Each structure stands twice: as structure tokens, then as C-alpha cells.
Symmetry: D2
Subunit: 386 residues, 4 copies
């Protein structure tokens, strides 16, 4: 509350470690947790199975009910997003799966969603695997798409890959009594805090930016106590758990999140302007050097431009394909938020059946922590290799 976000990222979820005479949280691989007696054991099992948080001093009983290393990572992100509690899972898709199953179980299987979403999130809603029905709606048509069966309104900003922004204040107003789930993977709690704009749930693919080194899969939703209990009820019986070492590395990554994001953001802001001058590129999508931020969201909603850039090329698919293959320092791979700069053709990786399929000339670029001159020299060499 009185500490700045930079301090909260370092010391968040590190309570009681200094008193115990330790520097970093220990990795407890224990699958089972012994109990003091039958009465407290049975009470603690039922308490956690029904989605409640662990009481201090009580036994965790089993790893599928509670794990301390995961709980430390959960409290660390909840403080950053200004949320009451948070629930962590194996991947970002496991968190989305639990969020949708919680809505279905509560008798609300219908979901209202904006079309520019992550490929996996879009495919999971379209298939209706978890007993869900979806109505694809635009920012202005959210209120109309709301049914008496809607359990959640799913939004993502900046969108993956185009980086289209969404006004969160208007979305919450349109949803009204329906909770809003905001995928804040790209912005991170450093740039955006949807809970402050009135959102109920905030999803993050911890695999990107929260980990920051491309070596820890994870998913986490910062939300109020009601949805946290519903998500833990699902987690206890579906079991898409985050491994203790995975939780350790994601919590470890949160300490350097503010420093890494600001460094990659500075490089991305400069690269977007330098690449715009190249004749092979027709458009540069970047919230800071924007062609789609007339609403003044950069300042009101986002405290920074981000570290992602989408580039439209003048030869369509052929130029986009050649540019990706001729990169040497920049690695052609899916995923983002890592220490190294990655590149992809979203239409072929993020390809068979879609209405909101991105342009063939579009190329997504995750900016890492390399020098700005070395990254432009490599991207210019790949563009000139046409």
C-alpha cells in the first residue's frame, strides 16, 4: 500500500523468510503433508477441498489441495495486481480452462468475448470442449451480446498479435453485473492493472514476462475471494498444478520484472521508429508509436508502450516468410517475454480455420534485452535478403 511497485516486486511473497533466517523461499517437493491429529486433519482437508485458502499453522494435507511455494507466488502477484487473492496452474491455458469450468459449474456456461484473442483461448471457446457456448462481440456490442446465461466477459489488451487496445472502463460498464476477465499477459502488472478499472479476474500466462527466461511454464489469475475459491475448487479435483520448482522460478522472475520490462520497452520504442523508416515495412503496430490509440489509453490505462511489435510487410506472405528465415541473432520461435528477441509469422504458427485470422504480411516481434543497434542490424539484414 505504502511501498512502490518496484519494491513490491522484490519483497512480494517473501514474508517470514527473514525471521526464519533464510534469503529465498525453499522448494518443498513433498506430495503429502502429515497432520497433527484426526480432528484438525479432517477439518483442514475439507477446508481446502472446498476451495478455501490455507489457515496459518494448519497442515497443507496434500499438494493437490495446497503447496507453500505456489502460495508465495500467488500472494506476490495479487499484491501487484491489487487483487484479494490469486490461483496458479501448470500453464496459462490451464488457468483459462479452470476459469471457464468454474463459470459452467455455477450455471453460467455462456461467454461474451472480443474476437482479437490468443489462438488457444479462441480455439478453446469455439470448440466448446468444457461445455461452453460463445457469442463473439465487438467492444461496442458487449452489452447486446450479454445473455441471462453469461458467466464471464473475456478481453485481451494489447491483443495477440495485432496489439489492438481495448478500453477497460467501457467494457466493465457494458458488462454491468457480469464479471470481466482481462488477459494482461502482454502489459504485465508493471504497465496495466485491470482490477483498478473494475475487472473481476486478471489472467497472466506466467510462461511470458513473469518467468522472463523461457524456462518456466505457468498460469495465474488475480481475482476477488469468491472467484479464487471457485478456481481452487476446480484445481483440487482437476489437478492442473504448478510444480514447486516452476513456482520458484516464476516468483524469482517477479523480482526482476520491473527492471526487465522497462529495459525491453526502451529497446522496443526505439526499434519501432527505426523499422518504420525501412521501405519494405508498410506499417508498425506499437501502442507508443500508434496508429490505433485515439482514445488516450496510453496514460489512463497503460503506463508504457510494451515490448511487443507487429510489422506489416510490402510483399505479403513471401516477404514475411523470407524475413523470418533470414534472421540469425533474432530467433524464429513462438512465445514472448524472454531475455532474447523472438520472431514469428502468426498466420502460420499462432493457419486452417478462422474469421479473425491476421494478415499474411504481419510479423510479431518479442523484444528482449539485447542492444538496440545489434537487433536493428540483424532485422535490416533479413529484410535486405529478399
Amino acid at each position: 500500500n505504502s511501498m512502490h511497485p518496484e519494491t513490491l516486486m522484490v519483497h512480494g511473497g517473501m514474508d517470514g523468510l527473514t525471521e526464519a533466517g533464510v534469503h529465498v523461499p525453499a522448494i518443498d517437493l513433498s506430495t503429502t503433508n502429515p497432520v497433527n491429529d484426526v480432528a484438525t486433519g479432517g477439518d483442514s482437508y475439507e477446508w481446502l477441498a472446498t476451495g478455501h485458502a490455507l489457515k496459518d499453522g494448519d497442515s497443507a494435507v496434500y499438494q493437490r489441495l495446497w503447496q507453500p511455494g505456489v502460495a508465495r507466488f500467488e500472494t506476490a502477484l495479487a499484491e501487484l495486481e491489487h487483487a484479494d487473492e490469486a490461483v496458479a496452474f501448470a500453464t496459462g491455458m490451464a488457468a483459462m480452462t479452470a476459469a471457464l469450468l468454474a463459470a459452467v459449474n455455477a450455471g453460467t456456461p455462456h461467454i461474451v468475448a472480443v474476437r482479437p484473442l490468443y489462438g488457444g483461448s479462441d480455439h478453446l471457446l469455439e470448440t466448446g470442449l468444457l461445455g461452453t457456448t460463445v457469442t463473439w462481440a465487438k467492444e461496442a456490442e458487449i452489452a447486446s451480446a450479454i445473455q441471462d446465461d453469461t458467466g464471464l466477459v473475456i478481453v485481451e489488451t494489447p491483443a495477440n498479435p495485432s496489439l489492438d487496445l481495448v478500453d477497460l472502463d467501457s467494457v466493465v460498464a457494458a458488462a454491468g453485473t457480469v464479471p470481466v476477465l482481462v488477459d494482461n499477459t502482454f502489459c504485465t502488472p508493471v504497465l496495466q492493472q485491470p482490477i483498478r478499472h473494475g475487472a473481476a479476474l486478471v489472467l497472466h500466462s506466467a510462461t511470458k514476462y513473469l518467468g522472463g527466461h523461457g524456462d518456466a511454464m505457468g498460469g495465474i489469475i488475480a481475482t476477488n475471494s469468491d472467484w479464487a475459491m471457485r478456481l481452487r475448487q476446480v484445481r483440487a479435483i482437476t489437478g492442473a498444478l504448478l510444480h514447486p520448482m516452476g513456482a520458484y522460478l516464476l516468483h524469482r522472475g517477479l523480482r526482476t520484472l520491473a527492471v526487465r520490462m522497462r529495459a525491453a520497452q526502451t529497446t522496443a520504442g526505439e526499434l519501432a521508429e527505426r523499422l518504420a523508416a525501412h521501405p519494405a515495412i508498410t506499417a508498425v503496430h506499437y501502442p507508443g508509436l500508434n496508429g490505433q490509440d485515439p482514445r488516450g489509453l496510453l496514460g489512463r490505462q497503460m503506463s508504457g508502450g510494451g515490448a511487443m511489435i507487429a510489422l506489416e510487410l510490402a510483399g505479403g506472405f513471401d516477404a514475411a516468410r523470407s524475413f523470418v528465415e533470414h534472421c540469425s541473432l533474432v530467433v524464429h520461435a513462438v512465445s514472448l517475454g524472454g531475455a532474447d528477441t523472438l520472431i514469428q509469422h502468426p498466420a502460420s504458427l499462432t493457419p486452417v480455420a478462422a474469421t479473425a485470422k491476421p494478415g499474411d504480411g504481419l510479423i510479431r516481434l518479442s523484444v528482449g534485452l539485447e542492444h538496440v543497434d545489434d537487433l536493428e542490424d540483424d532485422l535490416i539484414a533479413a529484410l535486405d535478403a529478399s
Copy 2:
């Protein structure tokens, strides 16, 4: 194939490591996997997203699509269970969740299941969270319970906690064209191989026995290529993934599985007859004894008694509660298959908030036998029984 199961446990899933000049498989924590070009990268993405196994030489693309350390653990168990392929997940419940969602997606949401099952598996079917409908049936009433939209027949033997056995040959005959999923957590591939009896899928909570040290959560289903694709299709979009270090420790544990199981089984067989002589215990349930097994399943289906023992006490809830609390060496905790011997009161912990019929007897006590000496374990259990 021409190797004994003891040899297969050690060298299973270790192909190509000796040629690469390494002893154990490396732990690759990589979340993303680079691609050679857009054409091969995109094709590899679509094949793995549609649940296909990774073709040799192709890039894994992303960890939610494929991971090499998990794949090594998958091939190791599949060879032990005599299955074509296997799919691993974060926990045993994640594997069950994916198997049920695979059936629902194929237009078969109905499941026929025999009542004595693990608490979580029973609760997941009863709630119908994953869009499933269930008809609880007995071993003889499986054929009648089969509906036109049945996707699976779920069976578990020895059952958790009572250790009731199920004739798998008769179950497969009753199911007919419906695939049979058999939870083989308690027996492990050392004692039982349901695929040999005609089962289609074999679930294992790798958290117990496969890991063997109580430090690696996991779940895995050894099955034919058809269900392996359906399970991977669900895994790719739901993402209940097994962490590379978790997969490493479960694969590591498989090397010592036959040696650990036989050692714990020996101690369990000795403790079953020693505890039966005590007057405080009315009955000792143990698959290794042919008493409660009139069908001759120990020999045809199971090559050993196991390392789990259920005990019925003469004082009901009060004696069961006191016996658990007075144990010092034996630790009162949930879970099984570890090196440490554990004890639990199912009617007071896992099945306390459960209905009268589905919950076990208030005097029943489950005991997972470990690698401690038989004399030190009986002395501790006798001291706890005499303390009431």
C-alpha cells in the same frame, strides 16, 4: 520386448543416450522450441495441436505441444504396460480429467463405473463438471448399464481403500465395444498389466510408487494410438502439463520400481499375518492372501499381494482414531507408495464429507507399507494398538 520387466524398468525410455555420450536424460526447461522454416514449423505445430506424436527430427515448437523428458517417461511406462503409447499430465486427476473430456468431445459423455473408486475420481464423475453423466454399476451389471452414448468403463483394482478386487477379463467381455479404463496405481506394471486382459486405457497416479519417494506429482495413461491422440488433443489446449523435473524424477523412479515394490510387498505379507494375530483387529484385508479372493485373481491377474493393507478394528471410530494418533515411526498422512510407511483413517480424512454408502467403514484403516524393517514396523503398530 525379449527383455524381462526388471531390465525394462532400468533401460526403458533411455534410447539414444548411450550413443550421445550421456548416462541419464537431460532436463530441458525450454518453454519454446525454435523451427527451421515457416513451412515445417507450421506443419509441426498443426500435427502436435491435433494430438499427433512428435516425428523424429521435427521441432517440438512449444512445451504445451511436446516436451522430450516427458516423452521419455511416456515411452518407458508404455513398454512396461505393453501399450502402444502413453500421455503424461501434472497429476493423476489431470489424466482422469483429460480422459473424460476426450470421451465428451467424441460425442460419448456417458461413463459406466464400479462404485469402489478413489474419492477424487468418484467426486469428479458425480459432480458432472466436465459435462459427464454417470451410471454406477456393479461388476455383473456392467453390460446392462452400457448406453448408446457410453465413452468409457472405469474400473480400479485393488480398490482404494478396501482393496476389493475386480475380474478384468469379465469386465472387458461385459463392456464389449466400449473401451475399458483401468486404474492400476496400487498394483503398478510390476504386478498387473490390464492391457494384456483386454483393457484399452491404464491410468496411474505416478505420484505413488512410480515416483516412490513422495516428491514428484504426476499422472499417466498407457493406451492405444487412438486414445493417445485424444488425450494429447485435450492436453494441448487445457495444458495440465507435467514439469520436466517432475518427469525426470518419475522416469528415475521407474528404474528402482521392481526392486522397491518387491521389498515393500515382502514386508506387507509378513505384517498382514502378524497384525491378524492381534485381538484389537477383527479383519485384515490384503490381496496377497487368497481368503477374500475366491475367483483366483492372485496368479491370473496379479503376480503379487501388493504393499497396501486395510484393517478393521474392534472399537470402530474411537479405536481407529487412537491407533492413528499413537503411531510414532509410522506417519499419519494421506498418499501411498513412498519409502516411508504411512497410515490414514479414510472415514475421518478423505471420506469424512462423503455419503454413508460411498464412504468406507468407520473402523477401517489404510496402511501403505514402505522399506523399513518388518520388526520395527510391527513394534510401532502394536504400541499404538496397546495405547487404547
Copy 3:
């Protein structure tokens, strides 16, 4: 205290975990450890820097001074070897290095050692890198080789590779007042406990058998409080530390040590007799085999034959090289004590830096027996012998 060695391997070094509500010890990667105040922090720093063990409740201060996971592994082995304390290091050679530097620092740089030793230990003494002087002596000539500045008598039984046994009771009598250091890597605390025969220090290359899965390097010396303090003084300033995850896996491996050792020993006892019948092998060296132990050490010193087998071939170097290269299931690699069976030519790999006079025979081949089936291992070794 009144527990069997099998029970002690599972619960050794696991005190207070059940009270804290945890199953296995946590891996604390912390490099630094905060202090309550300047007075207690400074005193605990001085206490640990001077080689003393950590007091309960006091802060570890720094990892180079103390680490809890390593300390758990240390107390677990000390109970098995019947020693007061134990000190762990990065490798078996790091423990040997610290033992020699502790003797040199105490004004005793001379070491009396029996010639059949592991290659690295032999080369480290011959070079005199750590300011050591060595007098190579036989079992009977130990007393004569003792000089006024002797620090310790180094002995290893069964010796690497030949598997020569040494009567430890006679060695302690010959040494008299000088402490005896026994490398018990091959026997392990399951088969031999040199402390009961009067030895002062017991070195184990934890890398083999204690780990048991070929994935954790380590070294440890079970000894009295005086030598434990001297070893910790050297460790605090030289810093050859055992990593917390390495200590976790070696402590994890101790829980299955008795079960794994007995399983490999049974296979080795049968393999040594089956390989003796082959005409290509002239002699099979194994402690538990006729004409290999005239002093009756197998019974009063060793409770088992072990899991290592050395054998001489009738073609010398050419037959030894062909036999190693034609093995498929048995892997040609250095090291031992793992779950898989390994084979080597000691003259070309382990005992290569040793002087030509102390080098083993060219026809000799060392074999570490794993946990595979006895029939599959003999079929592979017979196929390799017949390929020449």
C-alpha cells in the same frame, strides 16, 4: 537408536519434518542467511568458521559456513556408519583433498597408504600437490612405514579394481596412535562399518551407491568430532561445497540403499559363478566366491559379497578391448553403483594416471552390477565374449 539399519536408511536425517507438516526435506538454495542481531550473528560466524557444527536456533550465516540440506545428509550417514559426525563435499576427491589438507595443516604431512587404491587417490598422493609425502606400504609393513610426522593411514577394501580385501582390525593395530582413513565406497554402510573395527575416518564417494542413479556427484567422511571440525575448517575456506539439490538426491538415495544393494549383490553373486564357467575368462574376482577370502573377513568384516566383479581374460589387451566394445545392454563407461550395469578396462581409463608398476593387468575388466535381470546380463556378456 534401537532401529535396524534398513529403518535408519529411510528415516535417517528426517528429524522434525513430520512435526513441521512436511514429507521430504526442502531444498533451500539460499546463499546467505540473515541474522537476528550483530552479537549473535558475529558469534555464529566465528563458531562455524572455526569448524564447529551449527547450534539449534542459530542462523547458518552463509552457505560456505553451513547448509541445512547438506547437514541432513551428513547426520543420516553418520548414524549408518556409527560415527559422531560427517562432513560432505562436491566430490569424493574433494573430501580426500580436505582430509589430506587437514593432516598437512596439523603438522603431519606424511601419509602411509596401501598400493591397491582408486587411480585419483593414488595420483593425488604421488604428485604431492597438497604438500603431502607418501610411503607406499603393504598390510604387514604398515607399522614399519609409520614415521614421526604421519597424519593418517589410507586403506580401501574391496580395492578398486582387483577387489583385494584388507583386514581392518590388523591395520588399526599396526597404525596404533595414527588415525586410519578407510574408503568404504564399494561396500557401503550396508556391508561394512570401519568405525566399529577402530577406524577414525570413513570416506565414501557418494557419487556411487549412495546416489545410486548416476546423477549426483558427492563425497562424505563419517568421523569423530575432532576430525569433523578440522574438515569443516578446510571446507569453510577452500569451499568445495555440495550443492543443495545434490545433497537432496544423495539423502533421497540413502532411503533405497539397502534395497538396491541387496538386489545388485544377488545378481552379482550369480553372474560371477556363471561367467567363471566360460572358457574365455581365466579368473573371476568376487569376495563371495571360493578361494578369494582365506582370512574369514566375509562374516566378521563384510556382511555381503558386494555388487562389483573384476575378471582376467585369456587374450590380454585384445580380448579385454573386444569384450568391452561388443557389449550392447551393458554400457562401456567409467563409474559404478548406478541402476544400470557398466563395464570398463581399468588400465586405459580409471587407473591410467597411476605409475606403470601399480597399474592393473591388461586382461582385467571391472564390472559394476546394476538392477537388471540376471539372465539378460549374462546373455549380453556371453554374446560380447563370443564376438572374439
Copy 4:
């Protein structure tokens, strides 16, 4: 075509990973490594036992001879320090131990060293445990202290704790033919590269800054092929090995080293000036502060002030003791280079040429500048 140091920190030691279809290096825990045949296996064993680097395609044979994850971390730091090769060990003290034993083995047991050094390095030389003799000399008296059997000239800048700087160009000139070992733990390859100034060996306690999260012990010396071969010869038989997961986390930390160091340096530069205005502190030692570097080393030798701050208090031991006990956000613990801010009393923790009792060392982390200021002022006012 040459890459900047910021790019080299990210992609250093990552060669062949993109071609193999992997993002980060795998952790190979293997203790032993199988061989193709007796002839190649035996030759590879002798090659690595005599301190040579592993040839591509050859088997590592055993972990005490070679480990791939450690080798990747070694090549990553060598490129940053502009050295030919590097040798990694369990701790910074294990690296110092091997550096001294390599000198003793070469018939040069005498070492010339400057008095302001790390406590452990100072105690290891004074004791003479590894068969070493030491002559303590000042910057100007290095040439005179050089004996016929001198193996190394050990220097550390900024010194631990006082942060006293040493002109490395003059030290190399004074040493002449004797190789110079520089402990570059505090500056890191981001700020200083002693190899460029003519140093032969550069030691780093990887435990600090290279790891950056206080969870990976380590030590590493960036040096030429001759000393690297000698250091690997000692490592192969003494066995103070860096664990594969430890090497993985230290290599992982190098990717964010430039970004973390610059962030902590900015906070330290502001804190040193804000704390100077407080009346309880008599003097604030920081390389970047005015009147603290008359030789112009900031610019020629160091590209930044660093993230460490030592300061003298006006009450001696009592004020220093109270200040560290009243800190709440800043943690009283030994060590440095982590994500969190640590504080210590160098006289009590870590009577041999000791620093002043009023001196307090402070490792600046990645927290906000205002929150650190508020906590330290509250602790000073509590006296």
C-alpha cells in the same frame, strides 16, 4: 559485425541451441559419460585429465573431467571479459584455492597481494594452508615485493568493504612478467574488464551479481589457455565442481546482468548522495561521488559507480550496531549482488587489519529509491 556487451550477455554460451531446436541449455545431471571405444575413451580421458578443453564430438568421460552446462557458462563469461577460456568451481573461494594451488604446483608458491581484500581471500593467504607464502604490499610497492618465486599478483577493485580503487594499468607495469589476478566481483564485466588493462586472470564470485538472486553459489576465473589448462588440471583431481543446476542458474543470471547492474547502480548513485545529507553519517564512500577518485579511473577503468556503498557513522560501534538492527525492509545479512538490499557490520561479521567499527557496507538491490531511503533514515533516527 561485433556485438555490444548487452547482446553478448543474452546470447553468450548459447551456440548450437537454436540449431538443435531448443531455447535454453538442458541440465545434464549425468555423473558418468559413455565412450564409443577403448582407444577414443582413453585418449579423451587423458586429454581432459591434463587440463585440455573438450573436443567437439568427443565424450566427456566423467563429470570431474568435463560437464557441458558448466562449459556453456564458462564460454559465456570468457566472451564478456575478453579472455580466451574460463574455469568454473563450486564457490569463489574454490576458484581462489585452485588459482593458488596451480601457482604452487608450477614452483611459484610466493604471492604478492594488496592489503584491502575479501576476508576469506586474506585469511587463506595468511594461513598458508595450500603451501603459499605471502608478502603484503601497497600499489606503489608491488615491484619491490616481487620475489624470484612469485606466481601471482592478487588485486581487488573496488575493495571489500571500503571500496578503495586500484590503478590496474600501473599494477601490470609493476608486476612485469608476473601474471596478475584481479577479483572483479564488485564491478562485474559490465563496468570493468581487467584483461583489457593487461591482467592475466580475472576471478568472480559468481554467487554475487552473476547469479543475481542469492540462490546459486559459484566461482569462475576468465584467463588465457595456459592458466585455464592449469586450473582444469587442479579441478580434475581436487574436484571442487560447480553443480549442473548451479551452472544453469549462473548462466541464466548473466542474461539479465547488464539490466540488473544498471538499475541497482542508478539507485546506489542517488542513495549515496541522499545519505550524505544525514548528520549521523560522517563520510559516504562510493566511486561515483566527487572527491573519491583523483586518478580518473571512472572512465578509463570503470564505466560506472557500482551498486555497493560503504559509510562511516558518527557513533562508532554503537551507532553501527543500532542502525543495522533497526532496518526492516533492508535485511541484515552477509553477501551482495542480489535483487534485495542487504546491510552488514564488516567488523563483527566477515584483529587482522580490520575496517573501522563505524563502517557499514550496503549492497543496493532493485527496490525503489524512495522506499530504501525511508527505511535507512528510520533506522538512523532510532538511535
